[PDB]
Write a protein that binds this ligand. Structure first.
Ligand SMILES: NS(=O)(=O)c1ccc(Nc2nccc(-c3cccc(C(=O)N4CCCCC4)c3)n2)cc1
Length: 832
């Protein structure tokens, strides 16, 4: 009974039971579980036991100019410790950890490990290329390391185990409880409706029947792999219910027989694409159908003017619509289009997918992919082939092929969007799902995040938990025994804190002030938790290098906000840690943290864009992971406060705002004038960073209670769930900058803003694809073409840089012209 016990262990880890068949009409999930064995085993056998155990976090990107500034000597200072003794050593930027190790004995079995972190500076890499080294250089910190024995790879031990038209009979529809109603049947492939048929409208009663065959113009031989039968109910004509059925199964068989499909009720989006059925069989709407159908499935140069029209089509942004003329030209000139990697999304949208001979021709075109294979990886371009507009296996596989060249550093930037893009896959087993599994199995940091990202979707997505649960098991069956124990300890702690979060929430109203009553109750529930249930220690989910110990209960509190988040603090479970600082984690219910995750990740990507142009915009995209429905954890950036709180420390709970208050607060919060000048510099940069980022994302218009600042001048926006001024640049921000006109700080700010804004515009398409993907996968509501179009207008598409500069400076002027108006209107709306 060891085998069942291990499965029982995996089930608690996943947050779902993969061995359950309650909501299946086929064996695709069992087939995927078997399908994923070999990809996992091939990777486990390939991984370096030593490098896997120490997981160096490295990049092959050049040191940015802004970071070379701190090395104007060509020397890097590393503090090598051993108990009370610690010696500073002079190192070259090109020096490898082994070279630093040898020269250490020259001055005075072992490996260098960061103080208070499961972070190792090891392998054939210049130290300047380790992330922690670059983290320290950016935040002027000393590079403190420890001399210790490497971890034992034995801990990572892996446990050994037909020419006729298509038709569908719509029998009827049934709901036990809930007007006119009708059914719409769609043959879909890439959100594209190849064929549509409707039934007659009828009164909406608990059981509505038709028994009418809906014959489609398309032949059974012409149905492409990944084609969906989309069944929708309409009740003003509003969509009310949907469900999908993959017409061709995982084994390439045409779907046959009677189907009783439990439908999703509407509350456009990735949830609308799911082939999963609503698991609630007692209350949901049902659709009964019958599938009868039987089957088993030297060029001429372009003229000067046509080539001009073709290139113009390829130059347009990703959300530019294709005319039938555009599609015809892209298709007729297939072979010329092939020489332009940027044409691939537009060219693949020109393929007549519901024609077997065209598909065959598309596959013919792909067989000779020298130009694609040789192209410089373009993540923006590659992500476009992994969205909702492409169901083709072969087209999606060529995009995955390009992601194979991404280094760990880059996989981490895109991991979240790549886990989400799995929602766009017609089948559970895919090249993308196999790529995600492989990379997670290859690297401990990717794997850690892959665990939490899948777990987040498994906990709350009825539409995708089944598929996502199968991928997580596949990752859990090869990560190793140490990681399996690691995850079990994080899961136990989060499970235990989620319950405490909910019970406290169930003791306090919306904004009804936090009293000693609920505070006593928190410290009581935490005491019972710690004494028995709380394990030894655990890795911090949004910071796997950090290890949290015992709860500092005396420091734990209930925050005064509508939602009642827990403020928790833990001792670092690592003796070698230089600081005597606790780990602060917020546990919250009430906000959809999935949206925040997506926003926070786009910010880290925006930081990476600015880095490739030697810019540091001082963003603070704090750790955040969604653990369930409206619940999750937030990294406490200690010694920070809300902009509204600074205003209320002087004038109280009034919209009556003052300008000098933030500047007063910063000077008052500074230990020396040197540090105060540094803080104004940090403010100018971080303000600019957030003004460009939030403007680009259409999340600029915000209430100051959702804008925070550190005692070190670092501004940072918070609470991104469920979201006039283009951005926040109020009189108090301007006063810190020396204006109330112009200023050397205000002019520096305008310059930083312009530089950052044009740096983002050089990655317009990448930003368009990440944004649309986010709107499609993160928002529970259905998305329109309008919502997606915002970012195109904000990125001043088809505009010169001088015009773009002119544009961003006008946005800065609107914030000056509006002053405190919008902030005051937010206070009247939200505070009252
Ligand atoms: N002095 S204080 O206002 O209690 C305070 C609050 C938070 C932090 N540190 C931090 N560092 C990163 C992200 C977030 C953060 C992000 C999103 C939401 C919240 C939040 O739930 N509150 C509600 C209560 C007031 C503030 C916002 C906090 N906080 C530091 C101090």
């Amino acid at each position: 009974e060891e085998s069942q016990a291990f499965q029982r262990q995996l089930t608690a880890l996943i947050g779902y039971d993969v061995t359950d068949v309650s909501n299946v009409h086929d064996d695709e999930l069992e087939f995927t579980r078997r399908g994923l064995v070999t990809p996992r085993m091939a990777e486990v056998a390939s991984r370096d036991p030593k490098l896997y155990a120490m997981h160096p976090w490295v990049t092959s990107k050049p040191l940015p100019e802004y970071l070379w500034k701190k090395i104007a000597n060509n020397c890097i200072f590393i503090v090598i410790h051993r108990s009370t003794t610690s010696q500073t050593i002079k190192v070259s930027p090109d020096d490898t950890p082994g070279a630093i190790l040898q020269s250490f004995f020259t001055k005075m079995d072992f490996v260098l490990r960061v103080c208070g972190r499961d972070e190792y500076l090891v392998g054939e890499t210049p130290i300047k290329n380790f992330q922690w080294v670059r983290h320290c250089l950016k935040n002027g910190e000393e590079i403190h390391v420890v001399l210790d024995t490497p971890p034992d790879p034995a801990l990572d031990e892996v446990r050994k185990e037909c020419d006729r038209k298509f038709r569908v009979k719509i029998r009827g529809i049934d709901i036990p409880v809930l007007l006119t109603v009708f059914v719409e049947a769609n043959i879909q492939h890439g959100q594209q409706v190849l064929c549509q048929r409707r039934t007659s409208p009828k009164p909406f009663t608990e059981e509505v029947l038709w028994n009418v065959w809906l014959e489609f113009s398309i032949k059974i031989k012409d149905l492409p792999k990944g084609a969906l039968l989309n069944l929708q109910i309409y009740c003003k004509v509003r969509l009310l219910y949907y469900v999908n059925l993959l017409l061709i199964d995982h084994r390439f068989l045409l779907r046959r027989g009677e189907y009783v499909l439990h439908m999703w009720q509407i509350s456009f989006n990735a949830d609308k694409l799911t082939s999963a059925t609503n698991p609630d069989k007692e209350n949901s709407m049902s659709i009964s159908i019958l599938l009868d159908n039987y089957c088993h499935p030297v060029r001429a140069e372009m003229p000067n003017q046509l080539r001009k029209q073709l290139e113009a089509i390829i130059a347009t942004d990703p959300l530019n619509p294709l005319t039938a003329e555009d599609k015809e030209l892209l298709w007729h000139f297939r072979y010329e289009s092939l020489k332009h990697p940027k044409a691939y999304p537009k060219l693949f949208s020109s393929v007549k997918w519901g024609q077997q001979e065209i598909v065959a021709k598309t596959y013919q075109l792909l067989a000779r992919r020298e130009v694609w294979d040789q192209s410089a990886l373009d993540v923006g371009l590659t992500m476009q082939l992994l969205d909702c507009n492409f169901s083709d296996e072969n087209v999606r596989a060529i995009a995955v092929q390009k992601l194979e060249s991404l280094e760990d550093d880059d996989v981490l930037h895109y991991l979240l969007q790549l886990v989400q893009a799995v929602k766009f896959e017609p089948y559970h087993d895919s090249a993308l799902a196999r790529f995600l599994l492989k990379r997670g199995l290859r690297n401990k940091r990717i794997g850690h995040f892959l665990f939490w990202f899948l777990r987040s979707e498994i906990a709350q997505s009825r539409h995708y938990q089944q598929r996502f649960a199968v991928i997580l098991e596949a990752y859990l069956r090869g990560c190793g025994t140490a990681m399996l124990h690691d995850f079990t300890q994080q899961v136990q702690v989060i499970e235990m804190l989620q319950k405490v979060t909910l019970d406290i929430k169930s003791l306090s109203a919306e904004k009804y002030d936090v009293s000693s009553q609920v505070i006593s109750q928190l410290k009581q529930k935490l005491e019972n938790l710690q004494n028995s249930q709380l394990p030894e220690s655990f890795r911090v989910p949004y910071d796997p290098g950090l290890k949290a110990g015992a709860l500092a209960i005396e420091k734990c509190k209930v925050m005064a906000s509508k939602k009642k988040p827990l403020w928790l603090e833990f001792k670092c479970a690592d003796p070698t840690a230089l600081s005597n600082e606790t780990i602060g984690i917020i546990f919250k219910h009430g906000d959809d943290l999935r949206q925040d995750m997506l926003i926070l990740q786009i910010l880290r990507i925006m930081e990476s864009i600015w880095e490739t142009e030697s810019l540091d915009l001082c963003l603070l995209p704090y750790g955040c992971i969604s653990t369930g429905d409206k619940i999750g954890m937030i990294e406490i950036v200690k010694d920070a406060t809300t902009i509204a709180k600074i205003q209320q420390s002087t004038v109280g709970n009034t919209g009556a705002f003052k300008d000098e208050v933030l500047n007063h607060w910063l000077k008052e919060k500074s230990p020396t004038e040197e540090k105060f000048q540094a803080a104004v510099e940090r403010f100018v940069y971080s303000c600019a960073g957030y003004c460009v980022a939030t403007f680009v994302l259409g999340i600029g218009d915000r209430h100051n209670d959702n804008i925070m600042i550190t005692e070190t001048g670092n501004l940072f926006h918070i609470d991104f769930g469920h979201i006039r001024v283009p951005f926040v640049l109020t009189p108090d921000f301007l006063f810190v900058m020396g204006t109330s006109k112009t200023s050397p700080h205000f002019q520096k700010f305008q310059d930083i803003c312009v530089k950052a804004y044009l740096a983002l515009r050089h990655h317009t398409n990448l930003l368009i694809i990440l944004f649309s993907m986010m709107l499609m996968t993160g928002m529970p509501q259905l998305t329109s073409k309008e919502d997606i179009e915002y970012i195109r207008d904000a990125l001043t598409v088809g505009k010169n840089e001088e015009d773009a500069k002119k544009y961003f400076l006008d946005q800065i002027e609107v914030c000056r012209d509006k002053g405190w108006t919008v902030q005051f209107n937010w206070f009247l709306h939200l505070v009252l």
